[PDB]
DNA sequence: AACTGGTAGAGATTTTTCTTAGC
DNA sequence: GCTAAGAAAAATCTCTACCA
DNA sequence: AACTGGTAGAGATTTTTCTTAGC
DNA sequence: GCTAAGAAAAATCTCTACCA
């Protein structure tokens, strides 16, 4: 048999650390034995997943981020469905001009989400007091991984190479973040729809406005409840809200969540 | 028409520094034309190209190194078209050192061409007069350019990794490198064929040897020239060697060179 | 005298239309962008650029080739 | 097919050849062809090293020679201490592959540093050529001399030559050619070796023709598309693969 | 670029009257242009 | 127990549009 | 009068550096 | 005028192999 | 005696960090 191969291979791992297939192969033990002894060895298994995440895209969803310049602090805050940039300059790295600016930003925009790295300025009480006034959901990132506000740096990146095109033209460097931030909002197209940022702000807001009121006009005259069967088990389910009557499915509405059924199981009662 | 919209669109571009589909957008030129405006402009053109390159792969073809571990030196030399290391330590970043051990390198294993980057140990005259002896093809790479020599880079990561494996068996540096280099040489197999890299070193070179021999018995005893017929012109070319006389095309040698031609265009003569 | 003229026309707007090229390179330690140059040749993976009565190797990687129409 | 191997089994009977050459000549898989070497009654080292050590100009030089092809690895030593023999041994076990040490009664040769080395790496240590690769080496190390300055320079240089350089033998191969050659012999004997196993951990059921009966368990040989190659009553033979039923033999 | 090529053909065709092809063929510009320039003309006709 | 990489540009390859010769 | 070869122009896909 | 990114591992998805119920 | 459902085991494809 192998059962002296596999005693054998332990202890060839325990001095030597091979691979799974050196073993497999020299011993003649099966695969999985070979991959469970590597499995087994805590000095091994250094290696991630190889996999990304997607980080979130709700229409009132900003970041936030800071970076260096010429010796100057700029800070930099992204709608991320749009790609809409806002810039200043601050004087120093403290909590105050952080606090005044998200104020300034939540004043002008409509703020529901804020996310921010674990940084020392973004976690203190004026901007905890600025996000309790404003009723913003202040939520951080996993220290040491900056993929986590990608949107931010990305627009860093952007932000530097409009400045460097276009230094020549200023005295100061503030104006020349003023002019790379109106270069930027509204000198260059192309993306999802052909839009430049400033017109895809526009129609992502003034879409969800006209949606909501008009979902609201539509739900609020209804009827034709749909009782619907469903689950492991051939139970029946309580009342619900039928959305829309499709060929081949409908879609109801049940505890405030949606769901699609297909027309076997279900009857509608007027 | 368009062409005050060109000349706008011109002077817009000279002021904000717009891309081409902005400018096709809003002034209605053809897509070409702010393709062009855009393309004649220094402060702009700031990409590559997005490929990469093939690095050479011959038989006979070693790439070299040199690395910093715990304060001490480790140069490495890697066989590329198999992947077999060898490393040692050195006392100092000289070029005696590097001559010794290329001297070495080259007193074991077949050594016809050498690739290294542009540092200062590599390019000495000690080196220059080892490679001259020993008849060795030395070529550099790019400057600030590390991608050239990948081979040799991701075979420091991965004795790294080992060296931090096994560090706690040994109580010097060089006896972890040296049992670094037993462990990846030996003890690792997966990749082209399922062999380690000893057992791949070996089959290319004998794999050479044999192929060589075996060429030159078939080839001294040969006949049946091939007159052939082909480029833009319906000329005719000299005497030629036939190769191999397959079903579809025959293999031609022609000056040194190798060529596939059809069987419509040739004929042969005994 | 004029049909030899029109040849020699036709033969030198060819020979100017084949190979004026102008190329954009990124080097140095600080990897920044330089002026325009002249491309001599053009293998797969690197090109081979003169600045300034200098001969430079660049990775096509690291430059940008402007044609012309 | 079965001519071949009844002409095979003929000239092995004859004329004991090896199995390389019954493979090449009769057309025959080269897992028949070691079944009819290996069911012989009468037919029945390429890792194997020497160290030595010897002075030269008031320095201490290490020759390390292969013994089945004559090949040269020599180094200069600091000193005759058995921590610097260790760590060439060590070297030369992470370079080649060394599965036997043949050495001589020395000091340094009988330390805990060597036995470590050896216990690490797996040799057989095993206390008594060299000497006529030494005469060969120093022969040459003389006559190329001045063109080095220091010594070990000279050393690296001799040691190139007599591997590389000096051809002689049968066929006129120098010794990198031949420690090449057999130990790519080497490395097809065991994969070829590993394949008969997996292979032979099998059984066959056998319908002989003109009967609906199933025979005994033989044993397979080789499986192709068509035919199907077994051995049964120490006997070789081919039976198509409609007659056949291959099944797994838990028989350890 | 050939947008010193536009404005020379602009100056060309005020003069002598060219034809589309041929001035796209001599001063290399697109060919969209060069019917853009036929077309403003108000005594010019493409064809 | 409720967290996450993304943006813009350079070429290569496929598709649509426009002019003109042949029947 | 109608169809199709052929070339230009626009639309789409794949791949890379940089921001921390 | 002659230069260039690559290696190994973790999961997901497809394919081959083995045991056993049904006719 | 023969076929096929079903589950385990091996082979193949796609994607990422690190080396400078
Ligand atoms: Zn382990
Ligand atoms: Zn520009
Ligand atoms: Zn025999
Ligand atoms: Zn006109």
Same mark, same amino acid.
């Given at each position: 048999g192998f059962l002296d191969g596999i005693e054998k291979a332990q202890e060839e791992h325990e001095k030597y650390h091979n691979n799974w297939r050196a073993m497999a192969e020299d011993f003649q033990i099966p695969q999985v034995v070979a991959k469970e002894i590597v499995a087994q060895c805590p000095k091994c298994q250094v290696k991630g997943e190889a996999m990304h995440g997607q980080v979130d895209a709700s229409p009132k969803t900003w970041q936030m981020d800071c970076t260096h310049l010429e010796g100057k602090v700029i800070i930099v805050a992204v709608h991320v469905a749009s790609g809409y940039i806002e810039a200043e300059v601050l004087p &120093?790295?403290?909590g105050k001009e952080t606090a005044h600016f998200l104020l300034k930003l939540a004043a002008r925009w409509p703020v529901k989400h804020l996310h921010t790295d674990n940084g020392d300025n973004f976690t203190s009480s004026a901007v905890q007091a600025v996000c309790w006034w404003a009723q913003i959901e202040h939520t951080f990132g996993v #220290?040491?991984? #900056? /993929?986590? /506000?990608?949107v931010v740096e990305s627009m860093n990146h952007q932000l530097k190479t409009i400045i460097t095109q276009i230094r020549?033209? &200023?005295?100061?460097?503030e104006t020349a973040v003023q002019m790379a931030v109106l270069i930027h909002n509204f000198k260059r197209k192309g993306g999802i729809g052909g839009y430049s940022a400033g017109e895809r702000i526009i129609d992502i807001i003034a879409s969800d406005l006209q949606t909501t009121k008009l979902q609201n006009q539509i739900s609020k005259i209804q009827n034709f409840r749909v009782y619907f069967r469903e689950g492991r088990d051939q139970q029946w389910k309580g009342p619900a809200t039928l959305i829309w009557k499709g060929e081949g499915a409908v879609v109801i509405q049940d505890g405030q969540d949606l769901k699609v059924v297909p027309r076997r199981k279900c009857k509608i009662i007027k």
């Open positions: &120093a790295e403290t #220290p040491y991984n #900056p /993929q986590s /506000q990608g020549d033209q &200023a005295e100061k460097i």
